Amino acid sequence: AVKKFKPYTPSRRFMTVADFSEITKTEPEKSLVKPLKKTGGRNNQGRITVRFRGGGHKRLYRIIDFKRWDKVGIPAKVAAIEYDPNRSARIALLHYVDGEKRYIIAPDGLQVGQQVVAGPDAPIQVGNALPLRFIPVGTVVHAVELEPKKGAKLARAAGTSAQIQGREGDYVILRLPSGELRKVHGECYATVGAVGNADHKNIVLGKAGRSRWLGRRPHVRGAAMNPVDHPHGGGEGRAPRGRPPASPWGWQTKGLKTRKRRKPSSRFIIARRKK
Amino acid sequence: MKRTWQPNRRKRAKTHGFRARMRTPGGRKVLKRRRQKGRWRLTPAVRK
RNA sequence: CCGAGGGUAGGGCCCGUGACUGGGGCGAAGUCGUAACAAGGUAGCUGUACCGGAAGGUGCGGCUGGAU
RNA sequence: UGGGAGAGGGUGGUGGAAUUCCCGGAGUAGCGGUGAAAUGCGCAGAUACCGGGAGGAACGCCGAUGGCGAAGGCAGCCACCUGGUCCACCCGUGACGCUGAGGCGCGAAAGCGUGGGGAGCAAACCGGAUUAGAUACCCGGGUAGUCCACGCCCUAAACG
RNA sequence: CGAUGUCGGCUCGUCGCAUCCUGGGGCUGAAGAAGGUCCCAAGGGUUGGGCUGUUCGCCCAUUAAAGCGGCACGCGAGCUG
RNA sequence: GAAUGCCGGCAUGAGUAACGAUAAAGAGGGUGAGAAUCCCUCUCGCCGUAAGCCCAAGGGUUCCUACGCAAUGGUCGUCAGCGUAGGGUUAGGCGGGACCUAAGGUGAAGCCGAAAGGCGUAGCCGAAGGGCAGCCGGUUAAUAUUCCGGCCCUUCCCGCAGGUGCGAUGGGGGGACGCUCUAGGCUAGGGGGACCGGAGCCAUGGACGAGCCCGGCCAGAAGCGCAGGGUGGGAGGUAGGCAAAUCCGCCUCCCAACAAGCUCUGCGUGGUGGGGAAGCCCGGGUGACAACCCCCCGAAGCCAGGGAGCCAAGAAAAGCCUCUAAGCACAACCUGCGGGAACCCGUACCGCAAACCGACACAGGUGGGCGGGUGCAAGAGCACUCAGGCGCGCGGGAGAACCCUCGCCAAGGAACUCUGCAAGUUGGCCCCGUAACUUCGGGAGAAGGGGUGCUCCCUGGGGUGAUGAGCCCCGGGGAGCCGCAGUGAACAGGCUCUGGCGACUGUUUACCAAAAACACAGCUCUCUGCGAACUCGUAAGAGGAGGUAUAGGGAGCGACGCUUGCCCGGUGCCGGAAGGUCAAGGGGAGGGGUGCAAGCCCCGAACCGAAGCCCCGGUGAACGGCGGCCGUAACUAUAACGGUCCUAAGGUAGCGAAAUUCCUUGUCGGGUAAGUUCCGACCUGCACGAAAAGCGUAACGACCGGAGCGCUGUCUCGGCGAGGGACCCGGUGAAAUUGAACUGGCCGUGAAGAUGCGGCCUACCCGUGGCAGGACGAAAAGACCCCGUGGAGCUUUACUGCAGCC
RNA sequence: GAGCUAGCCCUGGCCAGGGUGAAGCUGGGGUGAGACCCAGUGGAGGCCCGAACCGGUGGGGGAUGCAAACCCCUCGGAUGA
Ligand SMILES: [Mg+2]
Ligand SMILES: [Mg+2]
Ligand SMILES: [Mg+2]
Ligand SMILES: [Mg+2]
Ligand SMILES: [Mg+2]
Ligand SMILES: [Mg+2]
Ligand SMILES: [Mg+2]
Ligand SMILES: [Mg+2]
Ligand SMILES: [Mg+2]
Ligand SMILES: [Mg+2]
Ligand SMILES: [Mg+2]
Ligand SMILES: [Mg+2]
Ligand SMILES: [Mg+2]
Ligand SMILES: [Mg+2]
Ligand SMILES: [Mg+2]
Ligand SMILES: [Mg+2]
Ligand SMILES: [Mg+2]
Ligand SMILES: [Mg+2]
Ligand SMILES: [Mg+2]
Ligand SMILES: [Mg+2]
Ligand SMILES: [Mg+2]
Ligand SMILES: [Mg+2]
Ligand SMILES: [Mg+2]
Ligand SMILES: [Mg+2]
Ligand SMILES: [Mg+2]
Ligand SMILES: [Mg+2]
Ligand SMILES: [Mg+2]
Ligand SMILES: [Mg+2]
Ligand SMILES: [Mg+2]
Ligand SMILES: [Mg+2]
Ligand SMILES: [Mg+2]
Ligand SMILES: [Mg+2]
Ligand SMILES: [Mg+2]
Ligand SMILES: [Mg+2]
Ligand SMILES: [Mg+2]
Ligand SMILES: [Mg+2]
Ligand SMILES: [Mg+2]
Ligand SMILES: [Mg+2]
Ligand SMILES: [Mg+2]
Ligand SMILES: [Mg+2]
Ligand SMILES: [Mg+2]
Ligand SMILES: [Mg+2]
Ligand SMILES: [Mg+2]
Ligand SMILES: [Mg+2]
Ligand SMILES: [Mg+2]
Ligand SMILES: [Mg+2]
Ligand SMILES: [Mg+2]
Ligand SMILES: [Mg+2]
Ligand SMILES: [Mg+2]
Ligand SMILES: [Mg+2]
Ligand SMILES: [Mg+2]
Ligand SMILES: [Mg+2]
Ligand SMILES: [Mg+2]
Ligand SMILES: [Mg+2]
Ligand SMILES: [Mg+2]
Ligand SMILES: [Mg+2]
Ligand SMILES: [Mg+2]
Ligand SMILES: [Mg+2]
Ligand SMILES: [Mg+2]
Ligand SMILES: [Mg+2]
Ligand SMILES: [Mg+2]
Ligand SMILES: [Mg+2]
Ligand SMILES: [Mg+2]
Ligand SMILES: [Mg+2]
Ligand SMILES: [Mg+2]
Ligand SMILES: [Mg+2]
Ligand SMILES: [Mg+2]
Ligand SMILES: [Mg+2]
Ligand SMILES: [Mg+2]
Ligand SMILES: [Mg+2]
Ligand SMILES: [Mg+2]
Ligand SMILES: [Mg+2]
Ligand SMILES: [Mg+2]
Ligand SMILES: [Mg+2]
Ligand SMILES: [Mg+2]
Ligand SMILES: [Mg+2]
Ligand SMILES: [Mg+2]
Ligand SMILES: [Mg+2]
Ligand SMILES: [Mg+2]
Ligand SMILES: [Mg+2]
Ligand SMILES: [Mg+2]
Ligand SMILES: [Mg+2]
Ligand SMILES: [Mg+2]
Ligand SMILES: [Mg+2]
Ligand SMILES: [Mg+2]
Ligand SMILES: [Mg+2]
Ligand SMILES: [Mg+2]
Ligand SMILES: [Mg+2]
Ligand SMILES: [Mg+2]
Ligand SMILES: [Mg+2]
Ligand SMILES: [Mg+2]
Ligand SMILES: [Mg+2]
Ligand SMILES: [Mg+2]
Ligand SMILES: [Mg+2]
Ligand SMILES: [Mg+2]
Ligand SMILES: [Mg+2]
Ligand SMILES: [Mg+2]
Ligand SMILES: [Mg+2]
Ligand SMILES: [Mg+2]
Ligand SMILES: [Mg+2]
Ligand SMILES: [Mg+2]
Ligand SMILES: [Mg+2]
Ligand SMILES: [Mg+2]
Ligand SMILES: [Mg+2]
Ligand SMILES: [Mg+2]
Ligand SMILES: [Mg+2]
Ligand SMILES: [Mg+2]
Ligand SMILES: [Mg+2]
Ligand SMILES: [Mg+2]
Ligand SMILES: [Mg+2]
Ligand SMILES: [Mg+2]
Ligand SMILES: [Mg+2]
Ligand SMILES: [Mg+2]
Ligand SMILES: [Mg+2]
Ligand SMILES: [Mg+2]
Ligand SMILES: [Mg+2]
Ligand SMILES: [Mg+2]
Ligand SMILES: [Mg+2]
Ligand SMILES: [Mg+2]
Ligand SMILES: [Mg+2]
Ligand SMILES: [Mg+2]
Ligand SMILES: [Mg+2]
Ligand SMILES: [Mg+2]
Ligand SMILES: [Mg+2]
Ligand SMILES: [Mg+2]
Ligand SMILES: [Mg+2]
Ligand SMILES: [Mg+2]
Ligand SMILES: [Mg+2]
Ligand SMILES: [Mg+2]
Ligand SMILES: [Mg+2]
Ligand SMILES: [Mg+2]
Ligand SMILES: [Mg+2]
Ligand SMILES: [Mg+2]
Ligand SMILES: [Mg+2]
Ligand SMILES: [Mg+2]
Ligand SMILES: [Mg+2]
Ligand SMILES: [Mg+2]
Ligand SMILES: [Mg+2]
Ligand SMILES: [Mg+2]
Ligand SMILES: [Mg+2]
Ligand SMILES: [Mg+2]
Ligand SMILES: [Mg+2]
Ligand SMILES: [Mg+2]
Ligand SMILES: [Mg+2]
Ligand SMILES: [Mg+2]
Ligand SMILES: [Mg+2]
Ligand SMILES: [Mg+2]
Ligand SMILES: [Mg+2]
Ligand SMILES: [Mg+2]
Ligand SMILES: [Mg+2]
Ligand SMILES: [Mg+2]
Ligand SMILES: [Mg+2]
Ligand SMILES: [Mg+2]
Ligand SMILES: [Mg+2]
Ligand SMILES: [Mg+2]
Ligand SMILES: [Mg+2]
Ligand SMILES: [Mg+2]
Ligand SMILES: [Mg+2]
Ligand SMILES: [Mg+2]
Ligand SMILES: [Mg+2]
Ligand SMILES: [Mg+2]
Ligand SMILES: [Mg+2]
Ligand SMILES: [Mg+2]
Ligand SMILES: [Mg+2]
Ligand SMILES: [Mg+2]
Ligand SMILES: [Mg+2]
Ligand SMILES: [Mg+2]
Ligand SMILES: [Mg+2]
Ligand SMILES: [Mg+2]
Ligand SMILES: [Mg+2]
Ligand SMILES: [Mg+2]
Ligand SMILES: [Mg+2]
Ligand SMILES: [Mg+2]
Ligand SMILES: [Mg+2]
Ligand SMILES: [Mg+2]
Ligand SMILES: [Mg+2]
Ligand SMILES: [Mg+2]
Ligand SMILES: [Mg+2]
Ligand SMILES: [Mg+2]
Ligand SMILES: [Mg+2]
Ligand SMILES: [Mg+2]
Ligand SMILES: [Mg+2]
Ligand SMILES: [Mg+2]
Ligand SMILES: [Mg+2]
Ligand SMILES: [Mg+2]
Ligand SMILES: [Mg+2]
Ligand SMILES: [Mg+2]
Ligand SMILES: [Mg+2]
Ligand SMILES: [Mg+2]
Ligand SMILES: [Mg+2]
Ligand SMILES: [Mg+2]
Ligand SMILES: [Mg+2]
Ligand SMILES: [Mg+2]
Ligand SMILES: [Mg+2]
Ligand SMILES: [Mg+2]
Ligand SMILES: [Mg+2]
Ligand SMILES: [Mg+2]
Ligand SMILES: [Mg+2]
Ligand SMILES: [Mg+2]
Ligand SMILES: [Mg+2]
Ligand SMILES: [Mg+2]
Ligand SMILES: [Mg+2]
Ligand SMILES: [Mg+2]
Ligand SMILES: [Mg+2]
Ligand SMILES: [Mg+2]
Ligand SMILES: [Mg+2]
Ligand SMILES: [Mg+2]
Ligand SMILES: [Mg+2]
Ligand SMILES: [Mg+2]
Ligand SMILES: [Mg+2]
Ligand SMILES: [Mg+2]
Ligand SMILES: [Mg+2]
Ligand SMILES: [Mg+2]
Ligand SMILES: [Mg+2]
Ligand SMILES: [Mg+2]
Ligand SMILES: [Mg+2]
Ligand SMILES: [Mg+2]
Ligand SMILES: [Mg+2]
Ligand SMILES: [Mg+2]
Ligand SMILES: [Mg+2]
Ligand SMILES: [Mg+2]
Ligand SMILES: [Mg+2]
Ligand SMILES: [Mg+2]
Ligand SMILES: [Mg+2]
Ligand SMILES: [Mg+2]
Ligand SMILES: [Mg+2]
Ligand SMILES: [Mg+2]
Ligand SMILES: [Mg+2]
Ligand SMILES: [Mg+2]
Ligand SMILES: [Mg+2]
Ligand SMILES: [Mg+2]
Ligand SMILES: [Mg+2]
Ligand SMILES: [Mg+2]
Ligand SMILES: [Mg+2]
Ligand SMILES: [Mg+2]
Ligand SMILES: [Mg+2]
Ligand SMILES: [Mg+2]
Ligand SMILES: [Mg+2]
Ligand SMILES: [Mg+2]
Ligand SMILES: [Mg+2]
Ligand SMILES: [Mg+2]
Ligand SMILES: [Mg+2]
Ligand SMILES: [Mg+2]
Ligand SMILES: [Mg+2]
Ligand SMILES: [Mg+2]
Ligand SMILES: [Mg+2]
Ligand SMILES: [Mg+2]
Ligand SMILES: [Mg+2]
Ligand SMILES: [Mg+2]
Ligand SMILES: [Mg+2]
Ligand SMILES: [Mg+2]
Ligand SMILES: [Mg+2]
Ligand SMILES: [Mg+2]
Ligand SMILES: [Mg+2]
Ligand SMILES: [Mg+2]
Ligand SMILES: [Mg+2]
Ligand SMILES: [Mg+2]
Ligand SMILES: [Mg+2]
Ligand SMILES: [Mg+2]
Ligand SMILES: [Mg+2]
Ligand SMILES: [Mg+2]
Ligand SMILES: [Mg+2]
Ligand SMILES: [Mg+2]
Ligand SMILES: [Mg+2]
Ligand SMILES: [Mg+2]
């Protein structure tokens, strides 16, 4: 659960922090970190293409194993669970009896010293990876691939998961975190269990300073600008939107669906999301 | 107060220098023009 | 030195009073509607919640101190 | 010491019926609703029927005037953890008791906070009726909520 | 309109007189004291505060009186703003 | 002859303003044609967390010496950063390169673009980051870690001796890391010494003294010592580290393990080499065979890759070590020793400034390190002062107005004014003490008050020693002394009550607005299933993100508390395989031109034929909206109640003359002697209202109101005083402006406000200090306002296009 | 043209001194066990006071300036967005 502070500053009154309980090792494996290159929201032209980015804490990118079908049958002992700054989930360090060392995203309930393994023959226990065809209907999985051997794409953030719902030919039916119902190829790998650190969302940043530490620069409202800047700009005094509420670039921003309707994956999405 | 000209030799040579102009179409035109006008110095002098 | 007390400052308690305001009691010679006592014309009462000019209503759970 | 009965409490699992929604089939002129109607739904194919899927909530018969708990209260089934109580033996302790201002804990429902979940139901709200009027009683909708966890609230025709 | 700085205050005055006061008068429904009203008269004088940017105005305490106007609604190459 | 014309020259303003910080000057001696200004001595003042010293930028000879003074220097000049000339910068160890990588740049392969060109993994370039071997002293007019002296060290080549499976651009280890707090031990630096060295001194009343004054160190290989940093050892198994591996990883067994050992660094010591004060004497000589020791204080530096805590989770690559692959094992490498070899560029000087950026020798701007002492609680604050550097490149008089900065002020005490604007008051430390309210942190330094110097006596604990003395630190209790006054100087909150707005710390219109604006945690809607949506680009390619719905975009709202009603007719968005309309296209009934013909050519109906629109429905924390009239109650007044027109539906809670109220200084209450402002109420709200959120709300605010206490030259109402100017004399010497001028008042006239016209009046000629009423004074071809078929930013259900999407 | 200015990326550096005293830790009380309370230890914070440093609130001066934004006094932040 999340940690509160006494109100000994105005900002400590509401600031909350992760308890970091499941963490067992405060330093990253030297062979598995590499320098993450700060973009600031800028691209190869040097132009901002994602606004209000940059200035956050320096990080190294811990390499994560998003395949696991790499090493079928080769078990590994769960050696440590660590803090990864590049993602909301925690990471777990695996010592393969191979000798090889790898990170995965740490599932809910994964215990240090436990063994896990990937494969068609793997047991149905948290931390194990299998093609979806061999996971019992109804069990909840994470780190799901979208296509075979292309990497884990779904159910990766703190506390999230997906549930197998049924089998239709070469494909399985998943309920994605978003409530969407989607077909996924059965030969896509997953990992039984939900992603851990489920309290991530109960955290209260507490002060503007904290957002800055995360690389989030301040966001400027359209209504606070001028006509040259934004559809919502101008007006004497404050002003209501006075048009359909729009983006900085003029497209409507309350309800306008933006998925390409002729996308080939539509053939595989059973039901659009809930909530 | 802090004025506009804050001399910096590496900045000078790497911005206006001969090798900068030669690298680009507009830069070569600056040199073509300056040679056609008879400039004694095609490029700023930096003590390098 | 202590010292009646006087002076500066800051607290606590009580009383009187105050533009205005909330309901309460009584009056009855009025206006609205009829909530309760009969199965009182939606059985009643009830804690709570939300709502309605008003009596009141509805929801949830409870009691019989409810006629057939 | 050796036995019994039980919806007493907690946690984890799990079964079937029904409702609603979605997909497929088949079929057509109405369905629904009432005291009688209308709103509503329906030829953009409803209802009625067959198959599939999803989801939440509540447990038909057994069930009784029954059982249990200090009260509130407790009802599918399996297990684990745990409470009280009755019995027969008359074995051990030797008045160790009864009560109980404060205290502490528990405490239906509604309501609150944080996060889930949401089928049915249903405050508020919208419409249809009924009516002299009808901010109601009846009808078609419908949001909190009803459900789960954690923390509060501490009330009651909390009654025998 | 190749610019004549526009409210109010402060400072500094000066002038007009249709006079607020003080001086001189006639009439009175002028007993006296005190007023009313008109005439002469511009020499001097004509207060301090609360409100409001205010001018003005109301109000407080006085006063012989607490006058009204002109001077680019006097005066920003004098100040304020 | 005019174009506020263009170029040039020269006037006027004028011997006028000014001569650039108010840190400050006086005299004597010298030089010289000439001296306030150059040199020298004495006295004085100023800086000293600098106004002193070192370094990086940047500047580019400004450095040193001789000789000069036309110009430059705000005066002067014999002087100079100026003119002429000569001289001056010395490195294997300092910095950069022959080393490494960062963002970034470039770019084999590859990708894309009409052209030019845009990208792009590897590689390469790229530093103030990694890495790497030099310290003290002496010397020159001017360079010195560079020359010299002393003592040290690195790399490369070759050779020798011993050793080993040697061998890499490949594998591995390491390099290798945050913020905050911090231990132990040291050093830098500092203070004291009754001790050691020293030239001398005794004044002016006293002192020949534990007297005064001065100084009492620096570098150093191996070894040793003290303190720290780093690392476990052996065996077996081995499928992983894109080959191999004995290395590393992983599993197991065995000793060892907070030890030692091994290794590395700091500090001390250390053969040796150095330095060495005041004073006197003409940069040097002496001091002097200088001494070179003890004690206390003590880093933010060092040991260091130390330790702990925390969440925001903290470069790379080489050098280095190890592993092996070809290869090669006469080689090759490792270790010791010896000899040889060691290149290129920089080095002067200024460097918080007169040499850099500001047109100037410009009160501005400029990154890093050293920055002593005493006192004040501390400190880089403040005052003084060391070393060191200065007196700011015009002066001399005078003692007006006025101005600036400053000091005091009788009585009063905000009466000033738009406002206590400004200025007073308060002011550090220690002790006592402290309210509403509150989110329980706060409010709080609340408020308010007492203490504060010096002397003597007693006294408690700590640091260093040793346990003691000495030194240093933190105290406590008595008794006294002086003055107007003890943080005796300097530095150093005035306070309170009550509203508005914003939760808060932050952000902003560089150079007129710092705010109530923006941001902000937080809340809600919404889009997006990943080759995501969305953004930049024609594209490739990027960002998003090496992220995956607890995530990312967009929008509004803006901590938190209690809340957030009604209207879906219009617009928007979403849902809707029916229907209506609907383009190219399909189709070809029918019709036409022509030909002698077969034929060629053209028109063309029904019917099929997408999105979009129309149509059905949903949707408000989507755009937005949220009524009128008549009548009714035991007095009047009012209307719970009924009636009726209209609407998509008629504003709920809460608030209300408000940052909103026109009438308006609404009315009433409060405060005041008096209150258009303020607070509290009322409600006929011109024209509040619920996420362009509604109503509150502790704390916070250089925000804007209202009041009080304290204290004041703000004021009654002004006075005096100080310095810098103003004034006078010597020196240098501008400016805007300027049709020409021989340039008075009034009353008139005049294009309507006349020195210039009329009439009258006044008036000798010319200056200096002052004041501002006029010259419709100067400045800028009015910003207001209009005009121009003038321009530009912005908006949209204006027109017409285009991108983008369908 | 980003040697000024705005944002970001990479790599370095700087922030005297003083005050407040969160969590945690240990001890003590408490209880059936706890919550919790007290003392000590501790050293948190877009914490407080105040230099450097970064600013630019109010006022005065300056206004052919020392300066085409400066000077004096006062004032804001000063471990952090
Ligand atoms: Mg946890
Ligand atoms: Mg908290
Ligand atoms: Mg805390
Ligand atoms: Mg808490
Ligand atoms: Mg707060
Ligand atoms: Mg976390
Ligand atoms: Mg925590
Ligand atoms: Mg954790
Ligand atoms: Mg690496
Ligand atoms: Mg990466
Ligand atoms: Mg990146
Ligand atoms: Mg690039
Ligand atoms: Mg580019
Ligand atoms: Mg950019
Ligand atoms: Mg963007
Ligand atoms: Mg950005
Ligand atoms: Mg949150
Ligand atoms: Mg971050
Ligand atoms: Mg945000
Ligand atoms: Mg914003
Ligand atoms: Mg704006
Ligand atoms: Mg623009
Ligand atoms: Mg535009
Ligand atoms: Mg626009
Ligand atoms: Mg707008
Ligand atoms: Mg507007
Ligand atoms: Mg606006
Ligand atoms: Mg306006
Ligand atoms: Mg407006
Ligand atoms: Mg605006
Ligand atoms: Mg606005
Ligand atoms: Mg605004
Ligand atoms: Mg508008
Ligand atoms: Mg709006
Ligand atoms: Mg609009
Ligand atoms: Mg797919
Ligand atoms: Mg610079
Ligand atoms: Mg330059
Ligand atoms: Mg340079
Ligand atoms: Mg440079
Ligand atoms: Mg540069
Ligand atoms: Mg170049
Ligand atoms: Mg030239
Ligand atoms: Mg030439
Ligand atoms: Mg050029
Ligand atoms: Mg007395
Ligand atoms: Mg009745
Ligand atoms: Mg009834
Ligand atoms: Mg009833
Ligand atoms: Mg009501
Ligand atoms: Mg009503
Ligand atoms: Mg109701
Ligand atoms: Mg009951
Ligand atoms: Mg009865
Ligand atoms: Mg039954
Ligand atoms: Mg029973
Ligand atoms: Mg017995
Ligand atoms: Mg309860
Ligand atoms: Mg309940
Ligand atoms: Mg609730
Ligand atoms: Mg529902
Ligand atoms: Mg009615
Ligand atoms: Mg509600
Ligand atoms: Mg709720
Ligand atoms: Mg409830
Ligand atoms: Mg009962
Ligand atoms: Mg004009
Ligand atoms: Mg002119
Ligand atoms: Mg003019
Ligand atoms: Mg008279
Ligand atoms: Mg009489
Ligand atoms: Mg008369
Ligand atoms: Mg007179
Ligand atoms: Mg007169
Ligand atoms: Mg007035
Ligand atoms: Mg008026
Ligand atoms: Mg009188
Ligand atoms: Mg007028
Ligand atoms: Mg007048
Ligand atoms: Mg007028
Ligand atoms: Mg005037
Ligand atoms: Mg005037
Ligand atoms: Mg003026
Ligand atoms: Mg004026
Ligand atoms: Mg003038
Ligand atoms: Mg004037
Ligand atoms: Mg004024
Ligand atoms: Mg003004
Ligand atoms: Mg002419
Ligand atoms: Mg002219
Ligand atoms: Mg001219
Ligand atoms: Mg001309
Ligand atoms: Mg000219
Ligand atoms: Mg003159
Ligand atoms: Mg001065
Ligand atoms: Mg001279
Ligand atoms: Mg001379
Ligand atoms: Mg001299
Ligand atoms: Mg001094
Ligand atoms: Mg130069
Ligand atoms: Mg020279
Ligand atoms: Mg000369
Ligand atoms: Mg000369
Ligand atoms: Mg000169
Ligand atoms: Mg000069
Ligand atoms: Mg000479
Ligand atoms: Mg010179
Ligand atoms: Mg020479
Ligand atoms: Mg050498
Ligand atoms: Mg070479
Ligand atoms: Mg380097
Ligand atoms: Mg070197
Ligand atoms: Mg050395
Ligand atoms: Mg030199
Ligand atoms: Mg030299
Ligand atoms: Mg080897
Ligand atoms: Mg190697
Ligand atoms: Mg690293
Ligand atoms: Mg580093
Ligand atoms: Mg030393
Ligand atoms: Mg000392
Ligand atoms: Mg020394
Ligand atoms: Mg030691
Ligand atoms: Mg192997
Ligand atoms: Mg000597
Ligand atoms: Mg000698
Ligand atoms: Mg001797
Ligand atoms: Mg420090
Ligand atoms: Mg460490
Ligand atoms: Mg975190
Ligand atoms: Mg790290
Ligand atoms: Mg790298
Ligand atoms: Mg071989
Ligand atoms: Mg060897
Ligand atoms: Mg070479
Ligand atoms: Mg050279
Ligand atoms: Mg040199
Ligand atoms: Mg400076
Ligand atoms: Mg400096
Ligand atoms: Mg100089
Ligand atoms: Mg300039
Ligand atoms: Mg000068
Ligand atoms: Mg200067
Ligand atoms: Mg020193
Ligand atoms: Mg002091
Ligand atoms: Mg002090
Ligand atoms: Mg200071
Ligand atoms: Mg001294
Ligand atoms: Mg001077
Ligand atoms: Mg004079
Ligand atoms: Mg006085
Ligand atoms: Mg007073
Ligand atoms: Mg007084
Ligand atoms: Mg005031
Ligand atoms: Mg109070
Ligand atoms: Mg409190
Ligand atoms: Mg606070
Ligand atoms: Mg005090
Ligand atoms: Mg207060
Ligand atoms: Mg004394
Ligand atoms: Mg001072
Ligand atoms: Mg003071
Ligand atoms: Mg203070
Ligand atoms: Mg004051
Ligand atoms: Mg107050
Ligand atoms: Mg407010
Ligand atoms: Mg604010
Ligand atoms: Mg604001
Ligand atoms: Mg608030
Ligand atoms: Mg806020
Ligand atoms: Mg704020
Ligand atoms: Mg701050
Ligand atoms: Mg501006
Ligand atoms: Mg500004
Ligand atoms: Mg400007
Ligand atoms: Mg500007
Ligand atoms: Mg200003
Ligand atoms: Mg501003
Ligand atoms: Mg401010
Ligand atoms: Mg703003
Ligand atoms: Mg804002
Ligand atoms: Mg909110
Ligand atoms: Mg790409
Ligand atoms: Mg990407
Ligand atoms: Mg990426
Ligand atoms: Mg992402
Ligand atoms: Mg905002
Ligand atoms: Mg509250
Ligand atoms: Mg309503
Ligand atoms: Mg609507
Ligand atoms: Mg609509
Ligand atoms: Mg519209
Ligand atoms: Mg649609
Ligand atoms: Mg049909
Ligand atoms: Mg035909
Ligand atoms: Mg024919
Ligand atoms: Mg809503
Ligand atoms: Mg509308
Ligand atoms: Mg709206
Ligand atoms: Mg209204
Ligand atoms: Mg009102
Ligand atoms: Mg209001
Ligand atoms: Mg209004
Ligand atoms: Mg009006
Ligand atoms: Mg009216
Ligand atoms: Mg009004
Ligand atoms: Mg008015
Ligand atoms: Mg009034
Ligand atoms: Mg009045
Ligand atoms: Mg006022
Ligand atoms: Mg006002
Ligand atoms: Mg009214
Ligand atoms: Mg808005
Ligand atoms: Mg507003
Ligand atoms: Mg503020
Ligand atoms: Mg403020
Ligand atoms: Mg005065
Ligand atoms: Mg004086
Ligand atoms: Mg004077
Ligand atoms: Mg003077
Ligand atoms: Mg004077
Ligand atoms: Mg004379
Ligand atoms: Mg003439
Ligand atoms: Mg005229
Ligand atoms: Mg005239
Ligand atoms: Mg005349
Ligand atoms: Mg004439
Ligand atoms: Mg004439
Ligand atoms: Mg004439
Ligand atoms: Mg005359
Ligand atoms: Mg004049
Ligand atoms: Mg004039
Ligand atoms: Mg004239
Ligand atoms: Mg004039
Ligand atoms: Mg004038
Ligand atoms: Mg103009
Ligand atoms: Mg013009
Ligand atoms: Mg004009
Ligand atoms: Mg004009
Ligand atoms: Mg006009
Ligand atoms: Mg036209
Ligand atoms: Mg025209
Ligand atoms: Mg036009
Ligand atoms: Mg235009
Ligand atoms: Mg789009
Ligand atoms: Mg860095
Ligand atoms: Mg600081
Ligand atoms: Mg403490
Ligand atoms: Mg701890
Ligand atoms: Mg801060
Ligand atoms: Mg702070
Ligand atoms: Mg702080
Ligand atoms: Mg502070
Ligand atoms: Mg200022
Ligand atoms: Mg002031
Ligand atoms: Mg002043
Ligand atoms: Mg001023
Ligand atoms: Mg100016
Ligand atoms: Mg100053
Ligand atoms: Mg200050
Ligand atoms: Mg300050
Ligand atoms: Mg501060
Ligand atoms: Mg500080
Ligand atoms: Mg920090
Ligand atoms: Mg930071």
Curated annotation (Swiss-Prot), chain A:
PANTHER family: LARGE RIBOSOMAL SUBUNIT PROTEIN UL2M, RIBOSOMAL PROTEIN L2. NCBIfam families: rplB_bact. Residues 229-239 have a biased composition (Basic and acidic residues). This is Large ribosomal subunit protein uL2. The gene is rplB. Belongs to the universal ribosomal protein uL2 family. One of the primary rRNA binding proteins. Required for association of the 30S and 50S subunits to form the 70S ribosome, for tRNA binding and peptide bond formation. It has been suggested to have peptidyltransferase activity; this is somewhat controversial. Makes several contacts with the 16S rRNA (forming bridge B7b) in the 70S ribosome. Part of the 50S ribosomal subunit. Forms a bridge to the 30S subunit in the 70S ribosome, contacting the 16S rRNA. May also make transient contacts with protein S6 during translation in the 70S ribosome. Keywords: Ribonucleoprotein, Ribosomal protein, RNA-binding, rRNA-binding. One of its GO terms (cellular component) is large ribosomal subunit. Residues 222-275 are annotated as: Disordered. HAMAP family: Ribosomal_uL2_B. Residues 256-275 have a biased composition (Basic residues). It comes from Thermus thermophilus (strain ATCC 27634 / DSM 579 / HB8).
Swiss-Prot record, chain B:
The open reading frame (ORF) for this protein is entirely within the ORF for the RNase P protein (RnaP). The two start codons are separated by four nucleotides. Found on the solvent side of the large subunit. It comes from Thermus thermophilus (strain ATCC 27634 / DSM 579 / HB8). NCBIfam families: rpmH_bact. The keyword Ribosomal protein applies. This is Large ribosomal subunit protein bL34. The gene is rpmH. GO terms for cellular component: ribonucleoprotein complex; ribosome. Residues 29-48 have a biased composition (Basic residues). Signal peptide: none annotated. The keyword Ubl conjugation does not apply.
